[PDB]
């Protein structure tokens, strides 16, 4: 396959790159807020429990 | 007073992130994204060799 | 054509996540106000307080209640919202065939958490009952916010899969 | 003629590879969800939890279960699927004579 | 034409459910249009073959 | 905690690639692909000789 | 073929190294607990002590004992452990022929 109209390897590379970008974003959010569960998106049950305790 | 301190410490144990591991993950993911960008840049050029055939 | 149709479902998932984020911000504001109201009611439940202090805490309670209603009203994203009772649910695109992704709405207004625009205490016993009322309201608000966050994470996962 | 007929065989093999790729992507989604459900159930197994925390964990468990059901439902490639259990097996061309390439379906 | 693919000069959707039905209607229209185009292409190839024989 | 660290290190040993070998494998394969495209271009030229005979 | 077969040897050696690392972690925990029980038994060997202190030392000793048993039974790695006594020995690949790398179990 030497097609000039598509590039599946580029798609796989972009998928891996987007996964790495998401990992870096979540890690920098943990570094910035100082919390591994800063919102209900992180983990709803433990987040709500912690809000009640606080 | 001691009970309030216990509850606040419990919230902190429940939610707070461990920055020591975050420090290693940050540098590892920076290197990871740089390698991913390099590999995607290499993958983008797969169609460039086709023009040599003509 | 089927492959090119996926941009619409991606956009639907993205606007769903945006709406949920706006609702979560409003819910954080409501949670802080509810905690302050709990403190006010707990302090006003005391009998040893004089009349002027009781009136001051009652006024603070009313002001925070009005702020909760205003913040709940303001939680909209492009004229639609998931957390103020305006609609039962919002369905978001899941595939090219039009199959949805149901997301039940979670009302966080004072009407949706057992409170009322005119809710207030007038005696110490009324404040002591309002203590538990506010505790239950804060609890149900936290569960609704957690459900909304789980729905947002599901939207993100399906966006990656699509 | 029998040499030129191989193009249909190659196309069928490529289509089977694409179907398996879609199935594998859905499988990774379900594996991550299964891990999250493991964590939720394993945390809810504790007896020291209060009623509200248990109910929140149960709600997250139910939501992740429904999300697995949906993710398994959406795993299709051009109207066919090897992971949702729609059919027992798929057969792809292996020669110009019509010889098959049996691939038993794996319901997920 | 629009009449020949199951559509109409006045076809439209007024509500969200009408649009959801319109999705399937447009799917059917696209399918029948592609089928008709494939038939025309096969007929053209047949004309070319017969012209060579003639 | 030390258990979890040991299990994560073990999974890393099972799965993580060693990038130092890939740093050389990548250049070797790039050179080999360049030679392969050159050889294919050479093999394509076989038709040129026939014209000189006529 | 013979040279390419050695990747299995390498990965088996890595798996064995990980298993023994888990075993040493558990063993260090067990050693610390054993030293603490040494001190508890020595302190309770005193004759002049009264009954309540002796019962408290008994409770501490039993708790440390339970800690040792649980840390020992938790010393698994992928369903296999060299320190819990589940098996006499473990053998990992050492050559492409299939000759093993014998390592005897040391129950802790």
Short mmCIF file of N, CA, C and O in Angstrom, two decimals, chain E:
data_model
loop_
_atom_site.label_atom_id
_atom_site.label_comp_id
_atom_site.label_asym_id
_atom_site.label_seq_id
_atom_site.Cartn_x
_atom_site.Cartn_y
_atom_site.Cartn_z
N UNK E 1 -33.38 12.94 -9.41
CA UNK E 1 -33.98 14.15 -8.88
C UNK E 1 -34.50 13.90 -7.47
O UNK E 1 -34.46 12.77 -6.96
N UNK E 2 -34.98 14.96 -6.82
CA UNK E 2 -35.51 14.81 -5.47
C UNK E 2 -36.70 13.87 -5.44
O UNK E 2 -36.85 13.07 -4.51
N UNK E 3 -37.56 13.95 -6.46
CA UNK E 3 -38.69 13.03 -6.53
C UNK E 3 -38.24 11.60 -6.78
O UNK E 3 -38.91 10.66 -6.35
N UNK E 4 -37.12 11.42 -7.48
CA UNK E 4 -36.63 10.10 -7.80
C UNK E 4 -35.81 9.42 -6.74
O UNK E 4 -35.43 8.25 -6.92
N UNK E 5 -35.51 10.10 -5.64
CA UNK E 5 -34.73 9.51 -4.55
C UNK E 5 -35.50 9.51 -3.24
O UNK E 5 -34.91 9.40 -2.17
N UNK E 6 -36.82 9.63 -3.30
CA UNK E 6 -37.65 9.59 -2.12
C UNK E 6 -37.81 10.90 -1.39
O UNK E 6 -38.47 10.94 -0.35
N UNK E 7 -37.23 11.98 -1.90
CA UNK E 7 -37.34 13.29 -1.28
C UNK E 7 -38.41 14.11 -2.00
O UNK E 7 -39.14 13.61 -2.86
N UNK E 8 -38.51 15.39 -1.65
CA UNK E 8 -39.53 16.26 -2.20
C UNK E 8 -38.99 17.68 -2.20
O UNK E 8 -38.12 18.03 -1.39
N UNK E 9 -39.50 18.50 -3.12
CA UNK E 9 -39.06 19.89 -3.22
C UNK E 9 -39.36 20.67 -1.94
O UNK E 9 -38.72 21.70 -1.68
N UNK E 10 -40.31 20.20 -1.13
CA UNK E 10 -40.66 20.85 0.12
C UNK E 10 -40.17 20.09 1.35
O UNK E 10 -40.62 20.39 2.46
N UNK E 11 -39.28 19.12 1.18
CA UNK E 11 -38.81 18.34 2.31
C UNK E 11 -38.04 19.22 3.29
O UNK E 11 -37.17 20.01 2.90
N UNK E 12 -38.35 19.07 4.57
CA UNK E 12 -37.72 19.84 5.63
C UNK E 12 -38.11 19.23 6.97
O UNK E 12 -39.00 18.38 7.05
N UNK E 13 -37.43 19.68 8.02
CA UNK E 13 -37.73 19.27 9.39
C UNK E 13 -38.07 20.51 10.21
O UNK E 13 -37.41 21.55 10.07
N UNK E 14 -39.11 20.41 11.04
CA UNK E 14 -39.53 21.52 11.88
C UNK E 14 -39.17 21.34 13.34
O UNK E 14 -39.11 22.33 14.08
N UNK E 15 -38.94 20.11 13.79
CA UNK E 15 -38.59 19.81 15.17
C UNK E 15 -37.43 18.83 15.18
O UNK E 15 -37.02 18.31 14.14
N UNK E 16 -36.89 18.58 16.38
CA UNK E 16 -35.74 17.69 16.50
C UNK E 16 -36.08 16.26 16.08
O UNK E 16 -35.25 15.60 15.44
N UNK E 17 -37.27 15.77 16.42
CA UNK E 17 -37.67 14.43 16.00
C UNK E 17 -37.80 14.35 14.48
O UNK E 17 -37.45 13.32 13.88
N UNK E 18 -38.29 15.42 13.85
CA UNK E 18 -38.35 15.44 12.40
C UNK E 18 -36.96 15.35 11.79
O UNK E 18 -36.77 14.66 10.78
N UNK E 19 -35.97 16.00 12.41
CA UNK E 19 -34.60 15.89 11.93
C UNK E 19 -34.06 14.48 12.13
O UNK E 19 -33.32 13.95 11.28
N UNK E 20 -34.41 13.84 13.25
CA UNK E 20 -33.93 12.49 13.49
C UNK E 20 -34.51 11.51 12.47
O UNK E 20 -33.82 10.55 12.08
N UNK E 21 -35.75 11.73 12.03
CA UNK E 21 -36.30 10.92 10.94
C UNK E 21 -35.65 11.30 9.60
O UNK E 21 -35.41 10.43 8.74
N UNK E 22 -35.36 12.59 9.42
CA UNK E 22 -34.69 13.06 8.22
C UNK E 22 -33.34 12.39 8.03
O UNK E 22 -32.89 12.21 6.90
N UNK E 23 -32.68 12.02 9.14
CA UNK E 23 -31.40 11.33 9.04
C UNK E 23 -31.55 10.04 8.24
O UNK E 23 -30.83 9.79 7.26
N UNK E 24 -32.52 9.21 8.62
CA UNK E 24 -32.75 7.97 7.90
C UNK E 24 -33.26 8.18 6.49
O UNK E 24 -32.90 7.43 5.57
N UNK E 25 -34.08 9.21 6.30
CA UNK E 25 -34.56 9.50 4.95
C UNK E 25 -33.40 9.86 4.02
O UNK E 25 -33.33 9.37 2.88
N UNK E 26 -32.48 10.70 4.49
CA UNK E 26 -31.31 11.06 3.69
C UNK E 26 -30.41 9.85 3.47
O UNK E 26 -29.79 9.72 2.41
N UNK E 27 -30.30 8.96 4.46
CA UNK E 27 -29.53 7.73 4.26
C UNK E 27 -30.10 6.91 3.11
O UNK E 27 -29.36 6.46 2.23
N UNK E 28 -31.42 6.72 3.10
CA UNK E 28 -32.04 5.96 2.02
C UNK E 28 -31.85 6.64 0.68
O UNK E 28 -31.57 5.98 -0.34
N UNK E 29 -31.97 7.97 0.65
CA UNK E 29 -31.79 8.71 -0.60
C UNK E 29 -30.37 8.55 -1.13
O UNK E 29 -30.17 8.31 -2.33
N UNK E 30 -29.37 8.67 -0.26
CA UNK E 30 -27.99 8.50 -0.68
C UNK E 30 -27.75 7.10 -1.21
O UNK E 30 -27.07 6.91 -2.23
N UNK E 31 -28.31 6.09 -0.54
CA UNK E 31 -28.09 4.72 -0.98
C UNK E 31 -28.66 4.49 -2.37
O UNK E 31 -27.98 3.95 -3.25
N UNK E 32 -29.91 4.93 -2.60
CA UNK E 32 -30.51 4.70 -3.91
C UNK E 32 -29.81 5.52 -5.00
O UNK E 32 -29.67 5.04 -6.13
N UNK E 33 -29.33 6.72 -4.67
CA UNK E 33 -28.62 7.52 -5.67
C UNK E 33 -27.31 6.85 -6.07
O UNK E 33 -26.97 6.80 -7.26
N UNK E 34 -26.55 6.34 -5.10
CA UNK E 34 -25.31 5.65 -5.43
C UNK E 34 -25.58 4.39 -6.24
O UNK E 34 -24.82 4.05 -7.16
N UNK E 35 -26.66 3.67 -5.92
CA UNK E 35 -27.00 2.48 -6.70
C UNK E 35 -27.30 2.83 -8.15
O UNK E 35 -26.83 2.16 -9.08
N UNK E 36 -28.08 3.90 -8.36
CA UNK E 36 -28.40 4.31 -9.72
C UNK E 36 -27.15 4.74 -10.48
O UNK E 36 -26.98 4.43 -11.67
N UNK E 37 -26.24 5.46 -9.81
CA UNK E 37 -25.01 5.88 -10.46
C UNK E 37 -24.15 4.68 -10.84
O UNK E 37 -23.54 4.66 -11.92
N UNK E 38 -24.09 3.66 -9.98
CA UNK E 38 -23.34 2.46 -10.32
C UNK E 38 -23.95 1.75 -11.52
O UNK E 38 -23.21 1.24 -12.38
N UNK E 39 -25.28 1.70 -11.60
CA UNK E 39 -25.92 1.11 -12.77
C UNK E 39 -25.55 1.86 -14.05
O UNK E 39 -25.24 1.25 -15.08
N UNK E 40 -25.56 3.20 -13.99
CA UNK E 40 -25.18 3.99 -15.16
C UNK E 40 -23.73 3.73 -15.56
O UNK E 40 -23.41 3.64 -16.76
N UNK E 41 -22.83 3.61 -14.58
CA UNK E 41 -21.44 3.32 -14.91
C UNK E 41 -21.26 1.97 -15.58
O UNK E 41 -20.51 1.84 -16.55
N UNK E 42 -21.96 0.95 -15.07
CA UNK E 42 -21.90 -0.36 -15.71
C UNK E 42 -22.42 -0.30 -17.14
O UNK E 42 -21.84 -0.90 -18.05
N UNK E 43 -23.50 0.45 -17.36
CA UNK E 43 -24.03 0.59 -18.72
C UNK E 43 -23.02 1.26 -19.64
O UNK E 43 -22.87 0.86 -20.80
N UNK E 44 -22.32 2.28 -19.14
CA UNK E 44 -21.31 2.95 -19.97
C UNK E 44 -20.17 2.00 -20.34
O UNK E 44 -19.70 2.00 -21.49
N UNK E 45 -19.72 1.19 -19.39
CA UNK E 45 -18.66 0.23 -19.70
C UNK E 45 -19.14 -0.78 -20.75
O UNK E 45 -18.39 -1.18 -21.65
N UNK E 46 -20.41 -1.19 -20.65
CA UNK E 46 -20.95 -2.09 -21.66
C UNK E 46 -20.99 -1.46 -23.04
O UNK E 46 -20.69 -2.11 -24.04
N UNK E 47 -21.35 -0.17 -23.10
CA UNK E 47 -21.32 0.54 -24.38
C UNK E 47 -19.91 0.56 -24.96
O UNK E 47 -19.73 0.37 -26.17
N UNK E 48 -18.90 0.81 -24.12
CA UNK E 48 -17.53 0.85 -24.62
C UNK E 48 -17.10 -0.51 -25.18
O UNK E 48 -16.50 -0.59 -26.26
N UNK E 49 -17.41 -1.58 -24.45
CA UNK E 49 -17.04 -2.91 -24.92
C UNK E 49 -17.72 -3.24 -26.25
O UNK E 49 -17.08 -3.74 -27.19
N UNK E 50 -19.01 -2.93 -26.36
CA UNK E 50 -19.70 -3.21 -27.61
C UNK E 50 -19.17 -2.35 -28.75
O UNK E 50 -19.14 -2.81 -29.89
N UNK E 51 -18.75 -1.12 -28.47
CA UNK E 51 -18.18 -0.28 -29.52
C UNK E 51 -16.88 -0.88 -30.05
O UNK E 51 -16.63 -0.87 -31.26
N UNK E 52 -16.04 -1.39 -29.15
CA UNK E 52 -14.82 -2.05 -29.60
C UNK E 52 -15.14 -3.25 -30.48
O UNK E 52 -14.53 -3.45 -31.55
N UNK E 53 -16.12 -4.06 -30.06
CA UNK E 53 -16.49 -5.22 -30.88
C UNK E 53 -17.04 -4.79 -32.24
O UNK E 53 -16.78 -5.44 -33.25
N UNK E 54 -17.81 -3.70 -32.27
CA UNK E 54 -18.38 -3.23 -33.53
C UNK E 54 -17.28 -2.77 -34.48
O UNK E 54 -17.34 -3.02 -35.69
#
